[PDB]
Amino acid sequence: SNAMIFPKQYPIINFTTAGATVQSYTNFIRAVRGRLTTGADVRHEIPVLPNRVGLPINQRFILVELSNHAELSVTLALDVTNAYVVGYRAGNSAYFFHPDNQEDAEAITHLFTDVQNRYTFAFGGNYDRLEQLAGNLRENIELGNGPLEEAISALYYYSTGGTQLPTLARSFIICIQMISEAARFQYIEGEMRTRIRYNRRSAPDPSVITLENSWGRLSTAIQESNQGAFASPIQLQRRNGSKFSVYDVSILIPIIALMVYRCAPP
Ligand SMILES: Cc1cc(F)cc(C)c1-c1ccc(C(=O)O)s1
Ligand SMILES: [Cl-]
Ligand SMILES: [Cl-]
Ligand SMILES: [Cl-]
Ligand SMILES: [Cl-]
Ligand code: NI
Ligand code: NI
Ligand code: NI
Ligand code: NI
């Protein structure tokens, strides 16, 4: 059995806006969640993402290939430890957000290794920076199948001089929410399902934005809880922006679908 055969790239999950339905989007998010988790670490019915410490590099990333009606394709790279986009490939070029630390900087050298042209943005992929570059808040950027179709084209046309940085940043904001944040939250997945079901494009309201902002804090609160009870409340927001507190994991079980690993399971 002399000659060894190796895999040549990370797992790929495909989604196209051309013919997208509630069902095809649901199947896509379900498959992304299935690739992000082992299903062996589930706490209070909420799957936990793999622990970064000691994670083999061939387990570190998954690829999401997006296509639209123009058959333009871009491939996003997601870090399985936090479900978040670290960069993307369009044709012969790959673009990475500035890594948050040297560990992540090392990991992304393993991505898209056959690509001819590699680039790193000086800015990270966090919403605060992307909003500044886009000149627009998440609150003012429409989401839906139409926005996603446009975002795919903008990412694709960045290499050949079409797309400018403000539009690129806006397009990242769209992709990250419709893929990463939907994978993280059944609530945000459901918001996107409703937009697709009724052919709507609307910006996310404060309940979505505050969940996105609070995902890391919710993961810590749940994993360090006492039988699901938080030592201190987490403050979230309703659709109209009014604040409210969550004291226990039970109300979050239909809301959050994935958590970043914080500590070992019991
Ligand atoms: C009930 C709940 C528990 C959570 F842990 C997080 C959220 C965002 C919610 C909301 C669902 C709908 C809301 C509205 O209609 O304002 S608030
Ligand atoms: Cl529980
Ligand atoms: Cl490094
Ligand atoms: Cl542009
Ligand atoms: Cl522990
Ligand atoms: Ni730097
Ligand atoms: Ni904000
Ligand atoms: Ni702990
Ligand atoms: Ni623990």
Numbering used by the authors: -3 to 262
Publication excerpt:
The RTA-RU-NT-202, RTA-RU-NT-165, and RTA-RU-NT-192 structures were all determined at 1.8 Å. The RTA-RU-NT-165 and RTA-RU-NT-192 structures were determined in the monoclinic P21 space group with the RTA-RU-NT-202 complex structures solved in the orthorhombic P212121 space group. Although all three inhibitors bound similarly to the P-stalk pocket, RU-NT-202 adopted a notably different orientation, rotating its carboxylate moiety 91° compared to RU-NT-192 and RU-NT-165. This shifted the thiophene carboxylate position in RU-NT-202 ∼2 Å away from Arg234, thereby precluding any interaction with this residue and potentially reducing binding affinity for RTA. In contrast, the thiophene carboxylate in RU-NT-202 only interacted with Arg235, forming a salt bridge with the side chain and a hydrogen bond with the main chain of Arg235. The fluorine atom of the fluorobenzene ring in RU-NT-202 uniquely interacted with Val242 in RTA, while making closer contacts with Ile247 and Leu248. The fluorine atom in the fluorobenzene ring of RU-NT-202 interacted specifically with several nonpolar residues lining the P-stalk pocket, causing a shift in the position of RU-NT-202's benzene ring within the pocket compared to RU-NT-192, repositioning the thiophene ring and carboxylate group of RU-NT-202 away from Arg234. The RU-NT-202 carboxylate also rotated by 91° relative to RU-NT-192, further distancing the carboxylate of RU-NT-202 from Arg234. Consequently, the carboxylate group of RU-NT-202 did not interact noncovalently with Arg234, potentially reducing the binding affinity and inhibitory potency compared to RU-NT-192. Furthermore, the relatively altered position of the fluorobenzene ring in RU-NT-202 prevented hydrophobic contacts with Leu207, which may have further diminished the inhibitory function.
